[PDB]
């Protein structure tokens, strides 16, 4: 509604960039994450628990959840605006919705980025994971599928999300120096 | 027709949220539920009956049935309204359809949530299931595919359904304090 | 054309209900019907003939044929009406087409329901099928994939088809008490 | 252009019927025609040549070719009409195109039906085929996937094609009793 | 722009015919070209190099490249025409673009047909290929998947391409007897 | 906005050419890149690390990233233009956006072409790769799937990208001889 140049151009383009990466290239990279997960063992069920332990949620599913979460505040505004428009036919209020929506986008973007770091150590996928969860005997060596390609796409998504955080913080800074 | 702000915004957004989770992320998590179901046994047919025993209906199929059921009352209203519109050209009556439709949505939402709890104990998927159905000899250990990721998506869908119940109860409360 | 409330609302909603069940949930339930059909034998070709014997046509293919058959009479009417409209530009006749179309819909619905019962005994799929067709030696035990989930969807489709029969019979009753 | 009731209603509906069967139900029946083709032998390459010998072209591909061939004469007319319309802006001639198009449809329909009979003996798929093509040693037993379901759909397609031939012959009879 | 009857009817219909064959029937025929390529050997890597040696590019990929290549000259004209239209608002020139576009279509059609012959000997696929490329020991027998069905579709595409060449040559003949 | 003939015709046609190659033919040439990657070894995990070592990112994913990157500058301009249009309603500036966009396209095109050369040596895929990464014992022979077909498509994409660089350099040359 009252977006700046970066609000409606550099934020909408980067959002489409993230979706395009997810659906065109990234999704099929993760297609055989479990199928080509190879563990050096003869113990039945060891592969299931080790993959589940080291990948509690896939990266692409986490990114899909993140994109769904950061697009919801914009969607809520587009229905509140279309509702107040018809209600009158039957600033101030609009300002508080647009400032909170930016605030919620920053929180959602930072929360998922924090989840990525805590759950997956850093941002580089390792070739070998060592697993001692039951029923694997002692420690079992398992090997990840396409660790390098997944690292490349992880860096792309994290870097763009970090840029989107900065582009949202500046808009909050601009809106919080005039009003207050 | 006579919806409040939460009726046409917070209820329609949450409904789209559930569909987006189901088709974009959740469905492929359950892609190999039976293909990667691994049992420690040499008995033919044991894997078929143990998977069937512990998963009488898949979670995503239950969620798809729930969404189809909770969207039907809205669909029925949108056809009754378009029918009465042309019938006159050839409140009161509309009020009773909109109050019952909300009532049926609450019952449908609560019924499926109850089915989820009774059928699947709690809301967390276990890594190991112990099965003694014929023809499995004694008790056979079987291992579930992606139990943690399925648990995460189960919590998401249950929480949103619980919120949707509250958003529907308040609208019934508002409509049942003015008329009665 | 001259449909009642149940003719254009409760019949069109149920028809869409059946299609949504078929394409969104049911079809992938039957995805691995033969792939996970497991027989306890070492005889080549035994699995092929036993599956063919017990599933001469898949449930979803029978339902797809049923929906195609019960939608043609309506499609024929919508083209006859659009043809008579332009022919004049270049009741009575329309009444006989709409009464026969309902009649054919009832026959098609009842015929497929009868085919379901005769071919598949009841409406519950069994876990074990015993097969003695050549080249299987003596009697061979075979195990069905997802028997419980298939039973659940079978009951849903049969119940809705039975309701659709009743909704079509009443319209025939209403049209056959005024004219005759 | 100058079609009768059966020309534009009963012929167009049956054509959509054939396409609907092909794409919705029939295509996935033939999905594992070679994958589940099982031969009782240890000879490498025997399965490839026996399947190729007994299925020189799949039924669904033959039906797809038939539908493409019987729809081209109508497509050619729809471009000739749109070409003569603009040419004048820049009967007799139209009659000869519409009579030949019906004639070519009958020939194409009968040619493919004749191909089906000659290539595949009758219209019922057998469970067992005996194959002695090199490099199979002596005669090798092979087993077809879903022979009964394929027979059911073969009968449907042949019966509808036979009806379409009759519906096209009558139109030729009507056009060949007035002009000649 | 200045096309004859065969230019805009018989050439556009045949082009759609080739696309329809490619996407509806032909593409799935080549679905398991390498998966069902069977060689009589125990040498790892032998199957990879023999399939690559005998199929440097798949037939459907070659046909897709042909259709893409023979469609750009028409696409280039449709953008040059829309560019000159707006440029004036801001014959002779159009004639030279339409004559060269037909010329390039003939060259592209003939080049790919020549590539098909040189690369694949004739137009019939053989059941057996004998391969001696490293690391295969001596000569290894390998067997092609669906050779007869692929031969049938190869003949269809070659015959239509030959017809399209003749339809393009006549238009060049007509355009080169009036101007010169 | 101020594009020449080559800017809006020969550059947009080549861009569509690259997308058509990628989605219609190229993507499923790379469909089984890892599935048919065959290594001569019995060491678990050896295949995973050798494929990852020699294919850090798939060619099609690199091309998809390249197309996304070289289409962003045009997308940014189309939103800046639509933003300045409405801002006035509420040359010079447009010139600097269109000149930088061409500049960024050249850099992005050259950067990815350089990445292709450095990462993959030349532009021809080899049949055999020798791999000594842990845990592979000594040096292990591995064999690539469809090396010749991938080489053919690699040459096509490199040649078109090189042409696109030249078409973009000339436009920069034309714009940098009038202004400067
Ligand atoms: C809008 C603006 C957005 C900007 C976003 C910028 C994103 C930059 C992406 C750069 C990706 C590379 C950095 C992360 C990868 C680190 C690992 C790495 O370099 O891998 C080495 C080879 O990689 C390679 O060869 C990978 C090269 C990738 C080239 C760039 C693709 C485009 C192998 O080294 P290792 O053995 O340690 O690998 C261990 C992993 N398995
Ligand atoms: C509109 C508003 C809607 C609000 C809805 C809120 C939904 C919140 C979702 C939270 C999901 C986590 C809670 C349930 C999972 C319990 C199990 C759990 O924590 O798993 C541990 C690791 O999980 C993890 O590491 C899971 C991390 C998930 C990150 C958040 C997803 C984004 C492993 O612990 P264990 O060994 O007991 O696991 C046994 C399972 N196999
Ligand atoms: C518009 C209105 C249309 C109304 C249509 C109503 C349709 C109602 C669907 C009810 C489905 C259940 C009844 C048929 C299933 C009978 C078998 C059964 O109960 O299975 C037991 C567990 O089932 C279960 O746990 C199944 C629970 C399904 C929950 C409801 C679905 C939502 C296992 O008992 P068993 O060992 O005898 O099973 C033998 C089968 N393999
Ligand atoms: C517009 C108007 C269009 C009208 C078109 C009419 C088409 C009618 C379709 C009828 C299909 C059945 C007749 C052909 C099948 C002959 C074989 C047969 O009956 O199979 C028996 C069981 O079949 C069965 O149980 C199949 C029952 C199929 C019921 C109908 C489906 C709808 C097994 O007997 P066998 O051991 O000789 O089988 C040898 C085959 N493997
Ligand atoms: C617009 C106008 C476009 C016109 C284009 C016309 C295209 C005509 C297509 C004809 C295809 C057949 C000729 C080429 C196939 C030669 C091989 C052949 O006949 O195969 C025999 C059985 O074929 C068969 O049984 C194939 C029958 C195909 C029926 C027609 C398809 C519809 C087996 O004989 P073999 O043992 O030598 O086979 C060695 C191959 N593996
Ligand atoms: C807009 C304009 C854009 C223009 C772009 C032009 C692109 C031209 C594409 C030409 C592709 C061929 C050149 C590169 C391939 C080099 C390898 C080669 O020739 O392979 C030989 C057979 O190839 C073959 O038989 C390949 C034939 C391909 C036919 C042309 C495709 C249509 C086998 O020789 P080798 O044993 O050394 O192969 C080692 C590889 N595994």
From Swiss-Prot, chains A, B, C, D, E, F:
The chain crosses the membrane at residues 7-26, 60-80, 98-118, 152-172. It comes from the Eukaryota. Keywords: Calcium, Cell junction, Cell membrane, Deafness, Disease variant, Disulfide bond, Ectodermal dysplasia, Gap junction, Hearing, Ichthyosis, Membrane, Metal-binding, Non-syndromic deafness, Palmoplantar keratoderma, Transmembrane, Transmembrane helix. It is a multi-pass membrane protein. SMART domains: CNX, Connexin_CCC. Changing residue 130 to R: In a patient with congenital erythrokeratodermia; uncertain significance. GO terms for molecular function: calcium ion binding; gap junction channel activity; gap junction channel activity involved in cell communication by electrical coupling; identical protein binding. It is found in: Cell membrane; Cell junction, Gap junction. Its main location: membrane. Disulfide bonds join 39-142, 46-136, 50-131. Ca(2+) binds at residues 28, 31, 33. One of its GO terms (biological process) is cell-cell signaling. InterPro entries: Connexin, Connexin26, Connexin_CCC, Connexin_CS, Connexin_N, Connexin_N_sf. Residues 27-59, 119-151 are extracellular. GO terms for cellular component: connexin complex; endoplasmic reticulum-Golgi intermediate compartment; gap junction; plasma membrane. Changing residue 70 to L: In DFNB1A; sorted to the plasma membrane normally and forms gap junctions that were morphologically and electrically indistinguishable from those of control; the mutation reduces the permeability of GJB2 gap junction channels to inositol 1,4,5-trisphosphate (Ins(1,4,5)P3), resulting in blockade of the Ins(1,4,5)P3-induced inward calcium current in neighboring cells. Residues 1-6 are cytoplasmic. A hemichannel or connexon is composed of a hexamer of connexins. A functional gap junction is formed by the apposition of two hemichannels. Interacts with CNST. Forms heteromeric channels with GJB4. Belongs to the connexin family. Beta-type (group I) subfamily. Structural component of gap junctions. Gap junctions are dodecameric channels that connect the cytoplasm of adjoining cells. They are formed by the docking of two hexameric hemichannels, one from each cell membrane. Small molecules and ions diffuse from one cell to a neighboring cell via the central pore. PANTHER family: CONNEXIN, GAP JUNCTION BETA-2 PROTEIN. It is linked to Deafness, autosomal recessive, 1A: A form of non-syndromic sensorineural hearing loss. Sensorineural deafness results from damage to the neural receptors of the inner ear, the nerve pathways to the brain, or the area of the brain that receives sound information. This is Gap junction beta-2 protein. It comes from Homo sapiens.
């Amino acid at each position: 509604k009252h977006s700046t140049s970066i609000g409606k151009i550099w934020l909408t383009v980067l959002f489409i960039f993230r979706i395009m990466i997810l659906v065109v290239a990234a999704k099929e990279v993760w297609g055989d994450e479990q199928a080509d997960f190879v563990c050096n063992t003869l113990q039945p069920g060891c592969k299931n628990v080790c993959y589940d332990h080291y990948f509690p949620i896939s990266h692409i599913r986490l990114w899909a959840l993140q994109l769904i979460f950061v697009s919801t505040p914009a969607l809520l505004v587009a229905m509140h605006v279309a509702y107040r428009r018809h209600e009158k036919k039957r600033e101030g209020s609009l300002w508080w919705t647009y400032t909170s929506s930016i605030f919620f986008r920053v929180i959602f973007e930072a929360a998922f980025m924090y989840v990525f770091y805590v759950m997956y150590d850093g941002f580089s996928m390792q070739r070998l994971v060592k697993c001692n969860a039951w029923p694997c005997p002692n420690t079992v060596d398992c090997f990840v599928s396409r660790p390098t390609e997944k690292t490349v796409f992880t860096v792309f998504m994290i870097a763009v999300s970090g840029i989107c955080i900065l582009l949202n913080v500046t808009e909050l800074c601009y809106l919080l120096i005039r009003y207050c």
